[PDB]
Amino acid sequence: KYKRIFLVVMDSVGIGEAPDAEQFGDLGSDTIGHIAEHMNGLQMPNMVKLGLGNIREMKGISKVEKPLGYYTKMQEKSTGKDTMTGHWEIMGLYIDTPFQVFPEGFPKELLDELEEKTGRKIIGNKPASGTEILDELGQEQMETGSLIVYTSADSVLQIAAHEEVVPLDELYKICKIARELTLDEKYMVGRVIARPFVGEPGNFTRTPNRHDYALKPFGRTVMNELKDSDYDVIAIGKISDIYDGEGVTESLRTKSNMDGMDKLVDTLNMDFTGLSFLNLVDFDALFGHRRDPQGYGEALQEYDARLPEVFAKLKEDDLLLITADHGNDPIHPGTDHTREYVPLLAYSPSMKEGGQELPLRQTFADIGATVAENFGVKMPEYGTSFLNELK
Ligand SMILES: [Mn+2]
Ligand SMILES: [Mn+2]
């Protein structure tokens, strides 16, 4: 049916609280809706043309009589609302065990065991930017040989040490220890990150010697199946990292949302057969977690303005899928993601009559099931394809 599928995850761009939002303390959450209200009307005319307002009408986002493609929202079935859970579900899995975040730092039980296994004390133990934590604790780390352990708003455990105090190979081994300790549901972290730095007090800089220790998806994904069947799987942005490279044939790293759209355009220009899969992370990383609705709105408007060029490049046998992985409502309390429905837009220029409303997707895995059916690869255990509906 389709030679190429272009899948775009607008990271954290949720479309209103899910039925189980209360389980997470996420009642009232509405990412796009609250941004629209803050912007006094979001300017997203191209998403509107695709049918975004037909899913839900929000300030500045109204329904259209003839949407370019098909539209609906998706409900998350997996236990957690983190990025890995969302993406793993999108590609055909079901994840019972959520990844955890640590707004007050890591539990004493974990750090005590890390201290025992490394013969070093742990300092910091809080959310912080790389720069902030080095300014505060970099000197102490140097003087003592303690390990700086910190986190972000996401499911990460970061370990900073001066390269002349803890040599790279030693820091990597420490991170591997930390990775094994954090394969535990009491404190399951998405990735352990080595954060080596150099310099002197008041002038510390992190080195390009960072290493990541991620968990692989809890199952063979639709990406695995595509790769194993000799299809192209082109990962753009954080996609390769999120899946620990599983099922990825080529990875295109990006530096911003606009760079991600440039790479999407690059893949439109490529002759491939299979999947081009983009994550636009700025929404989540720069605006959602920082609870910055203005910046979030601006980012959404910048993204929307790039879309007509994508529309112009799509072929008759190309499918464009636009969705999200969870919410991250920039006016919600705290710094965590929000449990929300995610929008789904499915567009191909071969839809000569435009689109219609699809039935609500009961799991994100419906995307994976649709991709798998299209390319004739092994169907995921979870998910219901909407491929036949796109006609
Ligand atoms: Mn995410
Ligand atoms: Mn996040």
Q: Helix or strand or coil: residue 331?
A: coil
Same domain? For 317 and 382 the reply is yes
Instruction: Give the CATH number, domain containing residue 338.
Output: 3.40.720.10
H/E stretch holding 342: strand 342-347
Q: Helix or strand or coil: residue 243?
A: coil
Same domain? For 209 and 231 the reply is no
What's the CA-to-centroid distance between 289 and ligand 1, angstroms? Answer: 11
Which residues have CB under 8 Å from 208's CB, separation 6+? none
Cα–Cα distance for residue pair 257/304, rounded to 1 Å: 11
Same domain? For 150 and 227 the reply is no
Same domain? For 205 and 272 the reply is no
Same domain? For 201 and 154 the reply is yes
Which residues are registered as beta bridge partners of 289?
none
Ligand nearest to the CA of 285: 2
Binding-site residues for Mn(2+), please? 11, 284, 289, 325-326, 337
Ligand nearest to the CA of 284: 2
Overall size of the chain counted in residues: 391
- Contact between residue 189 and residue 155 where contact means Cβ atoms under 8 Å apart: yes
Same domain? For 114 and 210 the reply is yes
Q: What share of the chain is helix, strand, coil (3-state, %, to 5)?
A: 35, 20, 45
Same domain? For 241 and 257 the reply is yes
CA atoms within 13 A on the CB side of 9: 30
Cα–Cα nearest to 372, from 216, 238, 224, 245: 224
What's the CA-to-centroid distance between 10 and ligand 1, angstroms? Answer: 8
Cα–Cα distance for residue pair 7/237, rounded to 1 Å: 12
Which residues have CB under 8 Å from 338's CB, separation 6+? 14, 17, 21, 24, 26, 29, 31, 81, 326, 327, 328, 329, 332
**Exp. method:** X-ray
Same domain? For 64 and 105 the reply is no
Binding-site residues, please? 11, 284, 289, 325-326, 337
End position of a domain, from candidates 215, 234, 256: 215
What's the CA-to-centroid distance between 208 and ligand 2, angstroms? Answer: 23
Which residues have CB under 8 Å from 59's CB, separation 6+? 33, 36, 37, 39, 40, 41, 42
Q: Which domain holds residue 297?
A: 1-96+216-391
The phi and psi torsions of 37 (rounded to 5 degrees) equal: -65, -40
What's the CA-to-centroid distance between 100 and ligand 2, angstroms? Answer: 11
Quick count: other Cβ atoms within 10 Å of Cβ 115?
15
Q: What is the dihedral sign for C-alpha 228, 234, 239, 241?
A: positive
Which residues are registered as beta bridge partners of 126?
150
Cα–Cα distance for residue pair 274/44, rounded to 1 Å: 29
Which tokens is 137 given?
Answer: 């604790």
What's the CA-to-centroid distance between 304 and ligand 1, angstroms? Answer: 19
Ion ligand 2: residues, Cβ under 5 Å: 154, 284
Instruction: Give the CATH number, domain containing residue 169.
Output: 3.30.70.1250
Same domain? For 266 and 117 the reply is no
Cα–Cα distance for residue pair 282/301, rounded to 1 Å: 13
Count of domains observed in the chain: 2
End position of a domain, from candidates 215, 237, 272: 215
Kindly give the interhelix angle for 108-118 and 168-181, rounded to the nearest 10 degrees: 140
Cα–Cα distance for residue pair 173/380, rounded to 1 Å: 36
Same domain? For 162 and 206 the reply is yes
What's the CA-to-centroid distance between 325 and ligand 1, angstroms? Answer: 5
- Contact between residue 201 and residue 139 where contact means Cβ atoms under 8 Å apart: yes
Interstrand relation of 342-347 and 147-151 (parallel, antiparallel or unpaired): unpaired
Same domain? For 280 and 356 the reply is yes
End position of a domain, from candidates 166, 197, 215: 215
Which tokens is 104 given?
Answer: 């007050």
Same domain? For 21 and 148 the reply is no
